[PDB]
Amino acid sequence: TVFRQENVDDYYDTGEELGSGQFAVVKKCREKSTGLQYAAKFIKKRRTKSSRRGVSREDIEREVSILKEIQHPNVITLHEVYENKTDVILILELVAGGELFDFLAEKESLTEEEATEFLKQILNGVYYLHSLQIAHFDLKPENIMLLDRNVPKPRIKIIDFGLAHKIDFGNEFKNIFGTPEFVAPEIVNYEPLGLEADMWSIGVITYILLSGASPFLGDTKQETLANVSAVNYEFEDEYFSNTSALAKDFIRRLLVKDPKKRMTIQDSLQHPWIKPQFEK
Ligand SMILES: c1ccc2cnncc2c1
Ligand SMILES: [Cl-]
Ligand SMILES: [Cl-]
Ligand SMILES: [Cl-]
Ligand SMILES: [Cl-]
Structure with missing residues (x-):
């Protein structure tokens, strides 16, 4: 499955970082056309078929396919998906109160x-x-x-x-x-x-x-x-x-x-x- 290949920066401005993991980084962002705020999750793509770095396209497509199915108050909502040569970028619902881990x-x-x-x-x-x-x-x-x-x-x-x-x-x-x-x-x-x-x-x-x-x-x-x-x-x-x-x-x-x-x-x-x- 193919995602939007326009530069995400032409449609969103990014801000504070919200999460940072082994293969992904999440940045707060704002959609230029609506002023609505989201969390942009940048997932690093694998660069060669046999590599261990990055996430396989199969794994990325699975995550996206599941996110597209779901809509419920207690689960995150996917807004849109972009991609370029290095990353797949998931524009996700912003949940501003932080992790339950930090609250605890x-x-x-x-x-x-x-x-x-x-x-x-x-x-x-x-x-x-x-x-x-x-x-x-x-x-x-x-x-x-x-x-x-x-x-x-x-x-x-x-x-x-x-x-x-x-x-x-x-x-x-x-x-x-x-x-x-x-x-x-x-x-x-x-x-x-x-x-x-x-x-x-x-x-x-x-x-x-x-x-x-x-x-x-x-x-x-x-x-x-x-x-x-x-x-x-x-x-x-x-x-x-x-x-x-x-x-x-x-x-x-x-x-x-x-x-x-x-x-x-x-x-x-x-x-x-x-x-x-x-x-x-
Ligand atoms: C995924 C990862 C981190 C997030 C932080 N804040 N809002 C939404 C998020 C979605
Ligand atoms: Cl922002
Ligand atoms: Cl990660
Ligand atoms: Cl996530
Ligand atoms: Cl499967």
């Missing part, structure tokens, strides 16, 4: 209601995606952004569909591997992956929201991955003494090694607590 870091520890207020929105977004048979595969606090961080109950959007895949056969078997602290055991073990992997990631996020601590984090990436595969975590009393037994139950039912036994997104919404990769 800057703010004192959350209450159980503050945690569930964020969590219910994440679950609604993931319910939408899974209903579409879309696995995100990179859910974590850095990939959730707040619309306005200065309200009592911030609204959020899920971002970063760089690893997302359509799961039309129940599972996929491809080169898919997220951030060590959040990946499911099936990712660590290079097994076929489905929607269940996201549910594990939600369990990790929930643990962090309630405690400020990461359940499987080791001193090295290999330790973290070994802890995940062995389901080596526990609820530390120092951090969970004020947390309800029902919150711990919710987590326990997500941090399950066998993906078939793990709660699904629909199970998570009906749960009583809610219902109303290498070192170098």
